[PDB]
């Protein structure tokens, strides 16, 4: 199997280049076998709503087969639903076959064992089990096993919304086609559906939130319909995205306050984690409440190994993977999220511009990426954090070098799903914004006075 597919969170590969249905046998083989050596022969299988999932499925659930593990086969749902059947079933260890938000052909592999998501060394240690041969042999089982109706109604049931909104959703013809509309619309609301049917060919736009230009349509539709929220899921439904009455973008990070707020005041002194990329609005909000903000690394295995790690109630991503566990399970989730949010939106006289709008804010960029090479990502970090100078600043190195000024602060860190470098900048005034671009360029340069900074 090639190398590239293992990667830092997961794996992930192009069907019929990187990925094949033998790839997809051998890793349920993997898999199977390292969740035997943790002692836990049950396993959940998941696939999302792309092309390449029947075929690669049923590859994925005789490897686990063929190492002896019993199979709960929970069919087409969103990943947060496959990480609840991990949850709530016989096992604690669970497979998602998903390509998240990338395009038709791509596809992966999103694994828990014994209750831990697998990262890093863990994932290679899956590659290399095949390499050796170092597999389990033995004569396992599958059980269908109809998950979706208990999550719905799980949510359904902890869930109290105060007063009727009416919401559009756009699942970009992925999975969460499946049932977040539905449960929406149970919760109490009225829900205008955008590209709400499971399509593989992505024929609209690619469901990822995490670009305006695919939050489009929603927002266009919340103006026209006098909608009070709209909502965006990614492919896999563990992303969220969100618009309020007005048309404007909460960035995840934002809506995160909101959540922290909510989460702190039924726990004192709560841990809530966030990623480098998230303003450092949160950090004194969070404190703010009396709660302890915990930043750390980018990725969702990462954070979910964080939460464990910690305690923390609340974790979220700025990208828009966010992770209860008060009330929940600890799991990123973005239709749990969703129920979250009008939870606490129908609690609130306010329109939803309003609510969000009273929290500070940031002049801040988009986010910036530079193409650099697979193999020379980390070498490009590891100078900056030997040889860089930031002036200054609270200087965090937990994930590329992130640093904290008075008025601003700036990241550059190794994407670990694509061979590029991301960057972010805010801050109160345009000076300040400027000034750290100026420092994060020439620490830049410095290192090789070559690399592009468009920015
Ligand atoms: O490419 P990155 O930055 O390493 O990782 C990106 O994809 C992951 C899987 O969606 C998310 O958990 C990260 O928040 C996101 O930034
Ligand atoms: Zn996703």
């Given at each position: 199997l090639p190398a590239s597919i293992f990667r830092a969170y997961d794996i992930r590969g192009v069907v019929g280049?990187?990925?094949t249905a033998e790839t997809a046998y051998w890793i349920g083989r993997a898999i199977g076998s390292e969740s035997l050596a943790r002692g836990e022969p049950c396993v959940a299988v998941g696939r999302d709503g792309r092309l390449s999932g029947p075929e690669l499925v049923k590859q994925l659930i005789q490897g686990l087969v063929d190492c002896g593990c019993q199979v709960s086969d929970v069919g087409m749902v969103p990943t947060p639903v496959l990480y609840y059947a991990a949850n709530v079933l016989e096992g604690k260890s669970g497979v998602m076959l998903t390509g998240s938000?990338?395009?038709?052909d791509y596809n992966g592999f999103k694994i828990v064992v014994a209750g831990e998501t697998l990262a890093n060394e863990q994932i290679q240690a899956l590659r290399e089990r095949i390499e050796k041969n170092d597999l389990a042999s033995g004569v396992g089982s599958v059980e269908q096993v109809d998950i979706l109706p208990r999550y719905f109604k799980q949510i359904r049931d902890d869930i109290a919304m105060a007063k009727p909104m009416k919401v559009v959703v756009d699942c970009?013809?992925?999975?969460?086609?499946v049932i977040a509309p539905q449960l929406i619309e149970a919760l109490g609301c009225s829900v205008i559906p955008?590209?709400?049917?499971?399509?593989?060919?992505?024929?609209?736009?690619?469901?990822?939130?995490?670009?305006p230009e695919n939050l489009k349509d929603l927002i266009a539709k919340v103006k026209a319909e006098n909608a009070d929220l709209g909502l965006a899921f990614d492919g896999d439904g563990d992303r969220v995205g969100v618009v309020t009455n007005t048309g404007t973008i909460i960035y995840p990070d934002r809506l995160l306050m909101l959540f922290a707020k909510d989460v702190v005041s039924r726990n004192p002194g709560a841990d809530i984690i966030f990623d480098v990329?998230?303003?450092?609005r949160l950090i004194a909000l969070i404190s703010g409440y009396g709660g302890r903000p915990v930043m750390w690394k980018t990725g969702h295995s990462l954070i979910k190994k964080k939460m464990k790690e910690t305690g923390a109630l609340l974790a979220g991503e700025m990208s828009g993977h966010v992770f209860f566990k008060?009330?929940?399970?600890?799991f990123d989730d973005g239709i749990y999220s969703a129920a979250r949010l009008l939870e606490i939106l129908s609690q609130?006289?306010?329109d939803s511009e309003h609510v969000f709008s009273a929290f500070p804010s940031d002049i801040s960029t988009p986010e910036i990426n530079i193409t650099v090479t697979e193999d020379s990502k980390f070498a490009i970090i590891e100078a900056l954090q030997r040889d860089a100078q930031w002036g200054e600043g609270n200087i965090t190195?937990?994930?590329?070098v992130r640093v904290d000024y008075p008025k601003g602060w700036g990241l550059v860190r190794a994407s670990n799903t694509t061979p590029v470098l991301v960057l972010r900048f805010e801050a109160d005034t345009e000076e300040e914004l400027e000034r750290i671009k100026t420092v994060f360029r020439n620490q830049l340069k410095a290192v090789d006075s070559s690399l592009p900074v468009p920015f």
């Open positions: 280049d990187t990925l938000h990338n395009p038709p970009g013809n992925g999975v969460a086609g955008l590209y709400c049917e499971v399509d593989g060919n992505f024929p609209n736009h690619h469901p990822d939130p995490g670009k990329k998230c303003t450092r008060e009330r929940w399970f600890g609130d006289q306010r190195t937990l994930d590329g």
